[PDB]
Amino acid sequence: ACFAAGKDDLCTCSNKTESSPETVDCSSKKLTTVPTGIPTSTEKLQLNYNQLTGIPPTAFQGLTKLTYLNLDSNQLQYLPVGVFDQLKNLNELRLDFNKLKSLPPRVFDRLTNLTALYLEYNQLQSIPKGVFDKLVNLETLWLRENKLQSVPDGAFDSLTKVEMLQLHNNPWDCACSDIIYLRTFIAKNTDKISGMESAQCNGTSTAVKDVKTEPIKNVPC
């Protein structure tokens, strides 16, 4: 990917600047695997717009100084467990436009300095319990365009610095008991979190925030 720091190989490999980080740009390189050769000093890693089908548990091995990781627009089917656990210094993480159906438990749990998380345009059929519990520094959360029908109770409850929470184009089941946490959550926090009020019930026009809950409170999923 790079020959050394600031030394282009497969990828565009620039050094830090009085104003920019040491960045490795492997974007749009038609890559089917994660290249070895990325310097452990890398701060910003771009692997967007390639053909990755999966991620080797060893990919991001030494990269303990990464603040930005872009994995948008690949063919990711799964993420291995604990894949990001060594990237403790990450602020931004991008996984939009892949084929994720689920997420490994505690996947984001070591990414405590995360301020931005992009999970759009996948096929997530569920999220894990507590998957966002550790992300106390998170400001933006993008979950638009997946297969979610509900979120676990309290999913968002540690995200006290979130400013934007994008939620539409998710098939929310507004007729099952599980929607209730979300219904109340958006109704409570819509002045301080953006993008929630677009939330639309599956197969209808009715907004998720407007759902009567008392009537569905014992109807489970």
- CA–CA dist 120, 7 (Å, integer): 33
Amino acid at 119: L
CB 131 within 8 A of CB 162: no
Nominal resolution (angstroms): 2.5
Closest CA to 8 of 43, 40, 38, 34: 38
Terminal C-alpha separation, the chain: 47
Output the six-digit token pair for 8. Answer: 């282009």
Amino acid at 53: T
Residues β-bridged to residue 24: 13, 45
CB 211 within 8 A of CB 219: no
SS (H, E, C) the chain: CEEECCEECCCEEECCCCCCCCEEECCCCCCCCCCCCCCCCCCEEECCCCCCCCCCCCCCCCCCCCCEEECCCCCCCCCCCCCCCCCCCCCEEECCCCCCCCCCCCCCCCCCCCCEEECCCCCCCCCCCCCCCCCCCCCEEECCCCCCCCCCCCCCCCCCCCCEEECCCCCECCCCHHHHHHHHHHHHHCCCCECCCCCEECCCCCEHHHCCCHHHCCCCC
CB 132 within 8 A of CB 155: yes
- CA–CA dist 197, 157 (Å, integer): 18
Kindly give, in sequence order, each residue whose CB lies less than 8 Å from that of residue 123, ignoring residues fewer than 6 positions away: 99, 100, 101, 146, 147
Kindly give, in sequence order, each residue whose CB lies less than 8 Å from that of residue 210, ignoring residues fewer than 6 positions away: none
Could you tell me the residue ranges of all domains in the chain?
1-221
Experiment used for this model: X-ray
CB 179 within 8 A of CB 155: no
CB 42 within 8 A of CB 22: yes
CB 144 within 8 A of CB 168: yes
Amino acid at 133: D
- CA–CA dist 24, 40 (Å, integer): 11
